């Protein structure tokens, strides 16, 4: 059937207030990445 | 003091962490592709603080200045030293005879 193709498209694949809180989550992410 | 030296290390370390954060945030953009174009305030504040403290440590680390007047270090130089002339030493003194030969 693919002998007569009318239209095709390319689809991208799926992806693989307070400063104290920001630092806490950032450092937590740092530990997470280190563990990974 | 010597502790000053240790400080500068941590400053770089702090900066290093900032780098990681920045990289990650860049990845954030590289995974968000939004019109943010702005670093988080926390990370930039951390970077600035690291820069400041590291520079402050460096200021101590640079050393101590020296006075230009040539008559500074020569004030305490007594005449009993400048007269020795190490090249022109003579060994016919009472030191050898008095002491154990």
mmCIF file of N, CA and C in Angstrom:
data_model
loop_
_atom_site.group_PDB
_atom_site.id
_atom_site.type_symbol
_atom_site.label_atom_id
_atom_site.label_comp_id
_atom_site.label_asym_id
_atom_site.label_seq_id
_atom_site.Cartn_x
_atom_site.Cartn_y
_atom_site.Cartn_z
ATOM 1 N N UNK A 1 0.829 -1.197 0.000
ATOM 2 C CA UNK A 1 0.000 0.000 0.000
ATOM 3 C C UNK A 1 0.866 1.250 0.000
ATOM 4 N N UNK A 2 2.009 1.195 0.683
ATOM 5 C CA UNK A 2 2.891 2.348 0.782
ATOM 6 C C UNK A 2 3.510 2.727 -0.555
ATOM 7 N N UNK A 3 3.162 2.015 -1.628
ATOM 8 C CA UNK A 3 3.631 2.380 -2.959
ATOM 9 C C UNK A 3 3.128 3.759 -3.357
ATOM 10 N N UNK A 4 1.873 4.059 -3.038
ATOM 11 C CA UNK A 4 1.229 5.319 -3.395
ATOM 12 C C UNK A 4 0.909 6.085 -2.119
ATOM 13 N N UNK A 5 1.855 6.917 -1.709
ATOM 14 C CA UNK A 5 1.705 7.786 -0.553
ATOM 15 C C UNK A 5 1.244 9.154 -1.030
ATOM 16 N N UNK A 6 0.259 9.714 -0.341
ATOM 17 C CA UNK A 6 -0.329 10.987 -0.715
ATOM 18 C C UNK A 6 0.314 12.123 0.062
ATOM 19 N N UNK A 7 0.415 11.970 1.380
ATOM 20 C CA UNK A 7 0.961 13.006 2.237
ATOM 21 C C UNK A 7 1.663 12.349 3.414
ATOM 22 N N UNK A 8 2.751 12.969 3.860
ATOM 23 C CA UNK A 8 3.460 12.495 5.035
ATOM 24 C C UNK A 8 3.976 13.690 5.819
ATOM 25 N N UNK A 9 4.176 13.478 7.115
ATOM 26 C CA UNK A 9 4.754 14.494 7.976
ATOM 27 C C UNK A 9 5.728 13.855 8.950
ATOM 28 N N UNK A 10 6.652 14.670 9.443
ATOM 29 C CA UNK A 10 7.664 14.230 10.390
ATOM 30 C C UNK A 10 7.239 14.738 11.757
ATOM 31 N N UNK A 11 7.087 13.826 12.710
ATOM 32 C CA UNK A 11 6.703 14.176 14.069
ATOM 33 C C UNK A 11 7.879 13.939 15.000
ATOM 34 N N UNK A 12 8.172 14.932 15.834
ATOM 35 C CA UNK A 12 9.281 14.813 16.762
ATOM 36 C C UNK A 12 8.962 13.741 17.791
ATOM 37 N N UNK A 13 9.994 13.037 18.228
ATOM 38 C CA UNK A 13 9.782 11.999 19.208
ATOM 39 C C UNK A 13 9.501 12.625 20.570
ATOM 40 N N UNK A 14 8.837 11.892 21.460
ATOM 41 C CA UNK A 14 8.574 12.432 22.795
ATOM 42 C C UNK A 14 9.869 12.652 23.556
ATOM 43 N N UNK A 15 9.822 13.581 24.504
ATOM 44 C CA UNK A 15 11.000 13.883 25.300
ATOM 45 C C UNK A 15 11.395 12.679 26.142
ATOM 46 N N UNK A 16 12.699 12.493 26.305
ATOM 47 C CA UNK A 16 13.220 11.363 27.060
ATOM 48 C C UNK A 16 12.961 11.546 28.552
ATOM 49 N N UNK A 17 8.760 32.467 46.077
ATOM 50 C CA UNK A 17 9.001 33.845 46.489
ATOM 51 C C UNK A 17 10.280 33.952 47.309
ATOM 52 N N UNK A 18 10.499 32.985 48.197
ATOM 53 C CA UNK A 18 11.655 33.012 49.073
ATOM 54 C C UNK A 18 12.823 32.268 48.446
ATOM 55 N N UNK A 19 14.013 32.852 48.588
ATOM 56 C CA UNK A 19 15.216 32.240 48.036
ATOM 57 C C UNK A 19 15.587 30.942 48.741
ATOM 58 N N UNK A 20 15.185 30.778 50.003
ATOM 59 C CA UNK A 20 15.557 29.568 50.726
ATOM 60 C C UNK A 20 14.930 28.336 50.095
ATOM 61 N N UNK A 21 13.665 28.441 49.691
ATOM 62 C CA UNK A 21 13.026 27.325 49.023
ATOM 63 C C UNK A 21 13.690 26.996 47.704
ATOM 64 N N UNK A 22 14.055 28.029 46.940
ATOM 65 C CA UNK A 22 14.730 27.795 45.671
ATOM 66 C C UNK A 22 16.051 27.083 45.886
ATOM 67 N N UNK A 23 16.831 27.528 46.871
ATOM 68 C CA UNK A 23 18.086 26.841 47.134
ATOM 69 C C UNK A 23 17.847 25.417 47.588
ATOM 70 N N UNK A 24 16.823 25.207 48.406
ATOM 71 C CA UNK A 24 16.570 23.868 48.904
ATOM 72 C C UNK A 24 16.269 22.931 47.752
ATOM 73 N N UNK A 25 15.396 23.350 46.841
ATOM 74 C CA UNK A 25 15.057 22.449 45.750
ATOM 75 C C UNK A 25 16.237 22.294 44.803
ATOM 76 N N UNK A 26 17.003 23.365 44.593
ATOM 77 C CA UNK A 26 18.169 23.270 43.725
ATOM 78 C C UNK A 26 19.206 22.309 44.299
ATOM 79 N N UNK A 27 19.471 22.389 45.600
ATOM 80 C CA UNK A 27 20.438 21.478 46.197
ATOM 81 C C UNK A 27 19.900 20.057 46.189
ATOM 82 N N UNK A 28 18.589 19.906 46.374
ATOM 83 C CA UNK A 28 17.975 18.589 46.310
ATOM 84 C C UNK A 28 18.156 17.993 44.926
ATOM 85 N N UNK A 29 17.959 18.813 43.897
ATOM 86 C CA UNK A 29 18.177 18.373 42.528
ATOM 87 C C UNK A 29 19.633 17.991 42.336
ATOM 88 N N UNK A 30 20.536 18.740 42.967
ATOM 89 C CA UNK A 30 21.954 18.430 42.854
ATOM 90 C C UNK A 30 22.254 17.059 43.441
ATOM 91 N N UNK A 31 21.676 16.763 44.601
ATOM 92 C CA UNK A 31 21.879 15.450 45.201
ATOM 93 C C UNK A 31 21.257 14.362 44.337
ATOM 94 N N UNK A 32 20.098 14.651 43.743
ATOM 95 C CA UNK A 32 19.435 13.685 42.871
ATOM 96 C C UNK A 32 20.318 13.356 41.674
ATOM 97 N N UNK A 33 20.887 14.385 41.048
ATOM 98 C CA UNK A 33 21.750 14.168 39.892
ATOM 99 C C UNK A 33 23.015 13.423 40.290
ATOM 100 N N UNK A 34 23.564 13.740 41.464
ATOM 101 C CA UNK A 34 24.755 13.040 41.924
ATOM 102 C C UNK A 34 24.457 11.566 42.144
ATOM 103 N N UNK A 35 23.305 11.268 42.743
ATOM 104 C CA UNK A 35 22.917 9.880 42.948
ATOM 105 C C UNK A 35 22.716 9.167 41.619
ATOM 106 N N UNK A 36 22.085 9.841 40.653
ATOM 107 C CA UNK A 36 21.872 9.223 39.348
ATOM 108 C C UNK A 36 23.196 8.910 38.666
ATOM 109 N N UNK B 1 45.855 35.284 58.318
ATOM 110 C CA UNK B 1 46.022 33.875 58.688
ATOM 111 C C UNK B 1 45.921 32.901 57.520
ATOM 112 N N UNK B 2 46.318 31.653 57.777
ATOM 113 C CA UNK B 2 46.297 30.626 56.742
ATOM 114 C C UNK B 2 44.878 30.251 56.346
ATOM 115 N N UNK B 3 43.914 30.441 57.249
ATOM 116 C CA UNK B 3 42.537 30.047 56.972
ATOM 117 C C UNK B 3 42.010 30.755 55.742
ATOM 118 N N UNK B 4 42.546 31.944 55.485
ATOM 119 C CA UNK B 4 42.207 32.724 54.310
ATOM 120 C C UNK B 4 42.324 31.870 53.057
ATOM 121 N N UNK B 5 43.437 31.142 52.938
ATOM 122 C CA UNK B 5 43.657 30.254 51.802
ATOM 123 C C UNK B 5 42.493 29.289 51.619
ATOM 124 N N UNK B 6 42.120 28.588 52.690
ATOM 125 C CA UNK B 6 41.002 27.664 52.605
ATOM 126 C C UNK B 6 39.765 28.332 52.050
ATOM 127 N N UNK B 7 39.501 29.555 52.500
ATOM 128 C CA UNK B 7 38.331 30.285 52.040
ATOM 129 C C UNK B 7 38.261 30.345 50.527
ATOM 130 N N UNK B 8 39.357 30.733 49.880
ATOM 131 C CA UNK B 8 39.273 30.933 48.441
ATOM 132 C C UNK B 8 38.844 29.646 47.753
ATOM 133 N N UNK B 9 39.305 28.499 48.257
ATOM 134 C CA UNK B 9 38.891 27.240 47.665
ATOM 135 C C UNK B 9 37.387 27.126 47.619
ATOM 136 N N UNK B 10 36.753 27.331 48.769
ATOM 137 C CA UNK B 10 35.311 27.183 48.852
ATOM 138 C C UNK B 10 34.632 28.165 47.914
ATOM 139 N N UNK B 11 35.192 29.372 47.775
ATOM 140 C CA UNK B 11 34.601 30.318 46.848
ATOM 141 C C UNK B 11 34.488 29.716 45.466
ATOM 142 N N UNK B 12 35.594 29.168 44.964
ATOM 143 C CA UNK B 12 35.548 28.522 43.663
ATOM 144 C C UNK B 12 34.521 27.409 43.683
ATOM 145 N N UNK B 13 34.541 26.609 44.748
ATOM 146 C CA UNK B 13 33.572 25.535 44.867
ATOM 147 C C UNK B 13 32.168 26.095 44.751
ATOM 148 N N UNK B 14 31.892 27.172 45.487
ATOM 149 C CA UNK B 14 30.578 27.786 45.394
ATOM 150 C C UNK B 14 30.293 28.138 43.949
ATOM 151 N N UNK B 15 31.248 28.815 43.320
ATOM 152 C CA UNK B 15 31.100 29.186 41.926
ATOM 153 C C UNK B 15 30.859 27.950 41.083
ATOM 154 N N UNK B 16 31.629 26.893 41.344
ATOM 155 C CA UNK B 16 31.458 25.665 40.587
ATOM 156 C C UNK B 16 30.017 25.195 40.668
ATOM 157 N N UNK B 17 29.447 25.180 41.875
ATOM 158 C CA UNK B 17 28.066 24.735 41.985
ATOM 159 C C UNK B 17 27.171 25.612 41.131
ATOM 160 N N UNK B 18 27.388 26.927 41.197
ATOM 161 C CA UNK B 18 26.620 27.851 40.379
ATOM 162 C C UNK B 18 26.676 27.419 38.926
ATOM 163 N N UNK B 19 27.884 27.109 38.447
ATOM 164 C CA UNK B 19 28.050 26.678 37.067
ATOM 165 C C UNK B 19 27.097 25.534 36.776
ATOM 166 N N UNK B 20 27.132 24.503 37.624
ATOM 167 C CA UNK B 20 26.247 23.364 37.437
ATOM 168 C C UNK B 20 24.821 23.856 37.306
ATOM 169 N N UNK B 21 24.393 24.667 38.274
ATOM 170 C CA UNK B 21 23.039 25.191 38.258
ATOM 171 C C UNK B 21 22.773 25.879 36.933
ATOM 172 N N UNK B 22 23.680 26.776 36.537
ATOM 173 C CA UNK B 22 23.491 27.499 35.289
ATOM 174 C C UNK B 22 23.335 26.517 34.144
ATOM 175 N N UNK B 23 24.242 25.538 34.068
ATOM 176 C CA UNK B 23 24.153 24.536 33.017
ATOM 177 C C UNK B 23 22.775 23.907 33.035
ATOM 178 N N UNK B 24 22.354 23.456 34.215
ATOM 179 C CA UNK B 24 21.056 22.818 34.333
ATOM 180 C C UNK B 24 19.970 23.774 33.873
ATOM 181 N N UNK B 25 20.038 25.030 34.328
ATOM 182 C CA UNK B 25 19.012 25.983 33.932
ATOM 183 C C UNK B 25 19.043 26.152 32.426
ATOM 184 N N UNK B 26 20.251 26.166 31.853
ATOM 185 C CA UNK B 26 20.368 26.256 30.407
ATOM 186 C C UNK B 26 19.678 25.058 29.781
ATOM 187 N N UNK B 27 19.937 23.868 30.335
ATOM 188 C CA UNK B 27 19.236 22.679 29.879
ATOM 189 C C UNK B 27 17.743 22.894 30.023
ATOM 190 N N UNK B 28 17.339 23.508 31.139
ATOM 191 C CA UNK B 28 15.947 23.883 31.337
ATOM 192 C C UNK B 28 15.439 24.599 30.101
ATOM 193 N N UNK B 29 16.122 25.680 29.713
ATOM 194 C CA UNK B 29 15.690 26.394 28.523
ATOM 195 C C UNK B 29 15.773 25.460 27.330
ATOM 196 N N UNK B 30 16.865 24.696 27.247
ATOM 197 C CA UNK B 30 17.073 23.764 26.152
ATOM 198 C C UNK B 30 16.061 22.633 26.182
ATOM 199 N N UNK B 31 15.222 22.592 27.218
ATOM 200 C CA UNK B 31 14.130 21.646 27.318
ATOM 201 C C UNK B 31 12.790 22.340 27.478
ATOM 202 N N UNK B 32 12.781 23.662 27.642
ATOM 203 C CA UNK B 32 11.554 24.425 27.801
ATOM 204 C C UNK B 32 11.261 25.292 26.590
ATOM 205 N N UNK B 33 12.313 25.755 25.913
ATOM 206 C CA UNK B 33 12.228 26.613 24.731
ATOM 207 C C UNK B 33 11.117 27.651 24.862
ATOM 208 N N UNK B 34 11.126 28.362 25.983
ATOM 209 C CA UNK B 34 10.184 29.445 26.211
ATOM 210 C C UNK B 34 10.907 30.784 26.193
ATOM 211 N N UNK B 35 10.114 31.855 26.170
ATOM 212 C CA UNK B 35 10.674 33.198 26.113
ATOM 213 C C UNK B 35 11.015 33.676 27.517
ATOM 214 N N UNK B 36 11.789 32.883 28.256
ATOM 215 C CA UNK B 36 12.232 33.307 29.578
ATOM 216 C C UNK B 36 13.486 34.165 29.485
ATOM 217 N N UNK B 37 14.575 33.576 28.990
ATOM 218 C CA UNK B 37 15.839 34.274 28.769
ATOM 219 C C UNK B 37 16.307 34.982 30.036
ATOM 220 N N UNK B 38 16.107 34.330 31.178
ATOM 221 C CA UNK B 38 16.492 34.914 32.451
ATOM 222 C C UNK B 38 16.923 33.808 33.399
ATOM 223 N N UNK B 39 18.013 34.044 34.089
ATOM 224 C CA UNK B 39 18.507 33.121 35.091
ATOM 225 C C UNK B 39 17.677 33.265 36.364
ATOM 226 N N UNK B 40 17.577 32.217 37.181
ATOM 227 C CA UNK B 40 16.893 32.382 38.469
ATOM 228 C C UNK B 40 17.652 33.367 39.346
ATOM 229 N N UNK B 41 16.901 34.125 40.150
ATOM 230 C CA UNK B 41 17.528 35.101 41.037
ATOM 231 C C UNK B 41 18.387 34.425 42.096
ATOM 232 N N UNK B 42 17.970 33.250 42.566
ATOM 233 C CA UNK B 42 18.726 32.565 43.605
ATOM 234 C C UNK B 42 20.120 32.227 43.102
ATOM 235 N N UNK B 43 20.197 31.666 41.899
ATOM 236 C CA UNK B 43 21.471 31.188 41.384
ATOM 237 C C UNK B 43 22.397 32.361 41.093
ATOM 238 N N UNK B 44 21.852 33.461 40.573
ATOM 239 C CA UNK B 44 22.695 34.602 40.239
ATOM 240 C C UNK B 44 23.173 35.254 41.520
ATOM 241 N N UNK B 45 22.307 35.292 42.526
ATOM 242 C CA UNK B 45 22.706 35.837 43.808
ATOM 243 C C UNK B 45 23.818 34.986 44.391
ATOM 244 N N UNK B 46 23.695 33.671 44.253
ATOM 245 C CA UNK B 46 24.722 32.774 44.751
ATOM 246 C C UNK B 46 26.034 33.028 44.033
ATOM 247 N N UNK B 47 25.966 33.208 42.718
ATOM 248 C CA UNK B 47 27.162 33.456 41.927
ATOM 249 C C UNK B 47 27.828 34.757 42.343
ATOM 250 N N UNK B 48 27.029 35.799 42.543
ATOM 251 C CA UNK B 48 27.571 37.099 42.901
ATOM 252 C C UNK B 48 28.220 37.028 44.261
ATOM 253 N N UNK B 49 27.576 36.322 45.177
ATOM 254 C CA UNK B 49 28.122 36.188 46.509
ATOM 255 C C UNK B 49 29.430 35.424 46.464
ATOM 256 N N UNK B 50 29.486 34.372 45.652
ATOM 257 C CA UNK B 50 30.725 33.622 45.520
ATOM 258 C C UNK B 50 31.830 34.491 44.948
ATOM 259 N N UNK B 51 31.502 35.297 43.944
ATOM 260 C CA UNK B 51 32.487 36.201 43.375
ATOM 261 C C UNK B 51 33.009 37.159 44.426
ATOM 262 N N UNK B 52 32.097 37.743 45.191
ATOM 263 C CA UNK B 52 32.489 38.725 46.186
ATOM 264 C C UNK B 52 33.397 38.110 47.233
ATOM 265 N N UNK B 53 32.990 36.969 47.777
ATOM 266 C CA UNK B 53 33.755 36.372 48.857
ATOM 267 C C UNK B 53 35.096 35.894 48.347
ATOM 268 N N UNK B 54 35.124 35.368 47.133
ATOM 269 C CA UNK B 54 36.369 34.856 46.604
ATOM 270 C C UNK B 54 37.332 36.002 46.374
ATOM 271 N N UNK B 55 36.822 37.120 45.873
ATOM 272 C CA UNK B 55 37.678 38.276 45.679
ATOM 273 C C UNK B 55 38.175 38.779 47.022
ATOM 274 N N UNK B 56 37.298 38.776 48.021
ATOM 275 C CA UNK B 56 37.691 39.227 49.345
ATOM 276 C C UNK B 56 38.782 38.353 49.926
ATOM 277 N N UNK B 57 38.677 37.047 49.715
ATOM 278 C CA UNK B 57 39.729 36.162 50.163
ATOM 279 C C UNK B 57 41.010 36.472 49.428
ATOM 280 N N UNK B 58 40.911 36.690 48.118
ATOM 281 C CA UNK B 58 42.089 36.962 47.305
ATOM 282 C C UNK B 58 42.792 38.186 47.852
ATOM 283 N N UNK B 59 42.008 39.167 48.283
ATOM 284 C CA UNK B 59 42.584 40.391 48.808
ATOM 285 C C UNK B 59 43.505 40.072 49.967
ATOM 286 N N UNK B 60 43.093 39.154 50.827
ATOM 287 C CA UNK B 60 43.986 38.744 51.894
ATOM 288 C C UNK B 60 45.159 37.967 51.332
ATOM 289 N N UNK B 61 44.874 37.098 50.361
ATOM 290 C CA UNK B 61 45.869 36.212 49.782
ATOM 291 C C UNK B 61 46.944 36.958 49.025
ATOM 292 N N UNK B 62 46.654 38.163 48.537
ATOM 293 C CA UNK B 62 47.655 38.837 47.726
ATOM 294 C C UNK B 62 48.968 38.995 48.475
ATOM 295 N N UNK B 63 48.914 39.192 49.785
ATOM 296 C CA UNK B 63 50.143 39.277 50.541
ATOM 297 C C UNK B 63 50.157 40.553 51.342
ATOM 298 N N UNK B 64 51.348 41.057 51.631
ATOM 299 C CA UNK B 64 51.492 42.311 52.344
ATOM 300 C C UNK B 64 52.358 43.229 51.498
ATOM 301 N N UNK B 65 52.035 44.513 51.508
ATOM 302 C CA UNK B 65 52.818 45.465 50.744
ATOM 303 C C UNK B 65 54.173 45.706 51.389
ATOM 304 N N UNK B 66 55.077 46.264 50.599
ATOM 305 C CA UNK B 66 56.415 46.579 51.058
ATOM 306 C C UNK B 66 56.686 48.065 50.890
ATOM 307 N N UNK B 67 57.351 48.641 51.886
ATOM 308 C CA UNK B 67 57.624 50.069 51.893
ATOM 309 C C UNK B 67 58.729 50.395 50.897
ATOM 310 N N UNK B 68 58.602 51.544 50.235
ATOM 311 C CA UNK B 68 59.567 51.909 49.204
ATOM 312 C C UNK B 68 60.887 52.414 49.773
ATOM 313 N N UNK B 69 60.862 53.092 50.918
ATOM 314 C CA UNK B 69 62.080 53.672 51.474
ATOM 315 C C UNK B 69 63.112 52.591 51.762
ATOM 316 N N UNK B 70 64.271 52.700 51.112
ATOM 317 C CA UNK B 70 65.292 51.665 51.215
ATOM 318 C C UNK B 70 65.841 51.546 52.630
ATOM 319 N N UNK B 71 65.651 52.571 53.458
ATOM 320 C CA UNK B 71 66.177 52.608 54.814
ATOM 321 C C UNK B 71 65.240 51.950 55.815
ATOM 322 N N UNK B 72 64.337 51.098 55.338
ATOM 323 C CA UNK B 72 63.371 50.433 56.202
ATOM 324 C C UNK B 72 63.980 49.200 56.859
ATOM 325 N N UNK B 73 64.391 48.227 56.049
ATOM 326 C CA UNK B 73 64.935 46.983 56.571
ATOM 327 C C UNK B 73 66.367 47.129 57.060
ATOM 328 N N UNK B 74 67.058 48.193 56.666
ATOM 329 C CA UNK B 74 68.433 48.378 57.099
ATOM 330 C C UNK B 74 68.521 49.033 58.469
ATOM 331 N N UNK B 75 67.390 49.442 59.049
ATOM 332 C CA UNK B 75 67.444 50.114 60.342
ATOM 333 C C UNK B 75 67.945 49.171 61.426
ATOM 334 N N UNK B 76 67.523 47.912 61.381
ATOM 335 C CA UNK B 76 67.875 46.957 62.419
ATOM 336 C C UNK B 76 69.159 46.206 62.108
ATOM 337 N N UNK B 77 69.813 46.519 60.994
ATOM 338 C CA UNK B 77 71.034 45.827 60.595
ATOM 339 C C UNK B 77 72.206 46.437 61.350
ATOM 340 N N UNK B 78 72.622 45.789 62.433
ATOM 341 C CA UNK B 78 73.749 46.308 63.188
ATOM 342 C C UNK B 78 75.054 46.106 62.424
ATOM 343 N N UNK B 79 76.067 46.872 62.825
ATOM 344 C CA UNK B 79 77.362 46.815 62.164
ATOM 345 C C UNK B 79 78.102 45.509 62.405
ATOM 346 N N UNK B 80 77.677 44.714 63.386
ATOM 347 C CA UNK B 80 78.354 43.461 63.689
ATOM 348 C C UNK B 80 78.129 42.403 62.623
ATOM 349 N N UNK B 81 77.218 42.642 61.687
ATOM 350 C CA UNK B 81 76.895 41.684 60.642
ATOM 351 C C UNK B 81 77.501 42.082 59.308
ATOM 352 N N UNK B 82 77.396 43.361 58.944
ATOM 353 C CA UNK B 82 77.839 43.799 57.630
ATOM 354 C C UNK B 82 79.347 43.671 57.477
ATOM 355 N N UNK B 83 80.072 43.571 58.587
ATOM 356 C CA UNK B 83 81.524 43.550 58.571
ATOM 357 C C UNK B 83 82.093 42.147 58.390
ATOM 358 N N UNK B 84 81.242 41.117 58.396
ATOM 359 C CA UNK B 84 81.735 39.743 58.409
ATOM 360 C C UNK B 84 82.478 39.388 57.127
ATOM 361 N N UNK B 85 81.953 39.809 55.972
ATOM 362 C CA UNK B 85 82.557 39.528 54.674
ATOM 363 C C UNK B 85 82.763 38.027 54.519
ATOM 364 N N UNK B 86 81.704 37.275 54.210
ATOM 365 C CA UNK B 86 81.819 35.807 54.229
ATOM 366 C C UNK B 86 82.852 35.266 53.263
ATOM 367 N N UNK B 87 83.100 35.960 52.154
ATOM 368 C CA UNK B 87 84.084 35.468 51.200
ATOM 369 C C UNK B 87 85.489 35.564 51.771
ATOM 370 N N UNK B 88 85.749 36.577 52.594
ATOM 371 C CA UNK B 88 87.093 36.843 53.095
ATOM 372 C C UNK B 88 87.290 36.282 54.496
ATOM 373 N N UNK B 89 86.684 35.136 54.790
ATOM 374 C CA UNK B 89 86.808 34.532 56.110
ATOM 375 C C UNK B 89 88.243 34.101 56.391
ATOM 376 N N UNK B 90 88.632 34.211 57.658
ATOM 377 C CA UNK B 90 89.944 33.793 58.137
ATOM 378 C C UNK B 90 89.753 32.819 59.291
ATOM 379 N N UNK B 91 90.539 31.743 59.295
ATOM 380 C CA UNK B 91 90.403 30.697 60.300
ATOM 381 C C UNK B 91 91.628 30.604 61.203
ATOM 382 N N UNK B 92 92.269 31.736 61.478
ATOM 383 C CA UNK B 92 93.399 31.798 62.397
ATOM 384 C C UNK B 92 93.011 32.535 63.673
ATOM 385 N N UNK B 93 91.801 32.292 64.158
ATOM 386 C CA UNK B 93 91.276 32.976 65.328
ATOM 387 C C UNK B 93 91.273 32.034 66.524
ATOM 388 N N UNK B 94 90.893 32.579 67.680
ATOM 389 C CA UNK B 94 90.895 31.791 68.904
ATOM 390 C C UNK B 94 89.778 30.760 68.945
ATOM 391 N N UNK B 95 88.837 30.804 68.001
ATOM 392 C CA UNK B 95 87.743 29.845 68.020
ATOM 393 C C UNK B 95 88.223 28.415 67.878
ATOM 394 N N UNK B 96 89.136 28.180 66.936
ATOM 395 C CA UNK B 96 89.612 26.825 66.693
ATOM 396 C C UNK B 96 90.397 26.302 67.889
ATOM 397 N N UNK B 97 91.302 27.122 68.424
ATOM 398 C CA UNK B 97 92.150 26.679 69.525
ATOM 399 C C UNK B 97 91.324 26.471 70.788
ATOM 400 N N UNK B 98 90.409 27.399 71.080
ATOM 401 C CA UNK B 98 89.604 27.297 72.291
ATOM 402 C C UNK B 98 88.682 26.090 72.238
ATOM 403 N N UNK B 99 88.060 25.862 71.092
ATOM 404 C CA UNK B 99 87.093 24.795 70.920
ATOM 405 C C UNK B 99 87.802 23.497 70.562
ATOM 406 N N UNK B 100 87.025 22.431 70.478
ATOM 407 C CA UNK B 100 87.597 21.123 70.210
ATOM 408 C C UNK B 100 88.095 21.088 68.772
ATOM 409 N N UNK B 101 89.379 20.794 68.533
ATOM 410 C CA UNK B 101 89.935 20.700 67.182
ATOM 411 C C UNK B 101 89.703 19.329 66.556
#
